């Protein structure tokens with residue numbers, strides 16, 4: 001009740017900024033998350049003991065992979081916290097409850113492999129879930145952990161509020177399938193440009209929450225350049241391991257997954273910023289103007305990748 005989390009001064013100030021890095025002290029990440037829920041949602045949103053038990057079982061269900069790990073979960077949750085805190089009045093009580101949880105859970109039990117690799121390998125998950133294979137798994141793992149004894153952080157919601165928050169979580173997690181982002185952003189672009197975008201329309205809110213999820217999930221590209229550049233190393237460590245696994249199935253991998261083509265990374269990121277990242281943060285800033293610092297940081301990083309290509313670093 002009277003028990004607040006507090007962070008050291010530098011973290012207390014910098015955690016409010018979009019470009020905050022959660023740091024290398026793994027043991028501080030649970031407290032950072034609880035801090036964010038308490039300011040985002042309230043000290044009454046969750047029972048502390050259940051929330052702490054939930055966080056620790058979520059952590060145990062992330063694997064020791066280079067990029068899709070517990071540090072990514074907490075990093076994606078912080079980007080959502082910064083969006084929510086910069087857009088105080090736009091979101092419901094249930095949305096603030098659901099979205100930080102959705103971000104912490106969004107890659108539960110990730111193995112470091114794409115949906116395509118699972119399908120090419122003929123993994124059992126690819127027979128259970130024919131599209132958004134890993135994302136349906138992540139939602140399945142979230143419900144599993146919510147059903148463990150002492151882990152129902154939503155216990156005080158009515159039946160219909162509980163059903164609504166699990167549906168916010170399910171859609172938010174499915175929306176992190178990047179295959180779905182291209183069409184979602186295009187529809188949001190048309191709706192904003194023709195002035196049909198309506199935040200009282202639930203299917204429009206679902207789209208805007210979806211785009212928030214892509215924006216949070218890709219948030220490596222919105223950090224300060226030394227963070228962006230070092231995170232890219234972990235991202236490619238996974239891509240290249242998947243490429244090795246493609247070659248063991250007798251399949252030439254795409255260039256981004258082939259370690260033999262490491263020298264073209266700079267030109268690859270450049271393509272990714274122009275095709276995905278810039279469009280994403282551009283359309284998010286049109287809908288939610290106070291997210292502009294994500295777009296500005298993305299543009300700063302694109303210019304750094306252009307500098308790498310020119311041999312200026």
Ligand SMILES: CN(C)C(=O)c1cnn(C)c1C(=O)Nc1ccn2cc(-c3cccc(F)c3)nc2n1
Pocket residue numbers: 178218220221232235255256257261262263264265266267268269271272
């Ligand atoms: C930074 N960030 C978030 C990510 O990179 C990120 C996070 N998840 N996903 C899925 C991505 C993603 O799609 N990134 C990409 C996309 C296309 N690419 C093409 C190349 C490439 C091409 C030729 C040679 C070469 F070496 C690399 N590199 C790429 N990286």
Ligand SMILES: [Mg+2]
Pocket residue numbers: 106107134176177
């Ligand atoms: Mg994912």
Ligand SMILES: [Zn+2]
Pocket residue numbers: 072076106107176217
């Ligand atoms: Zn993710």
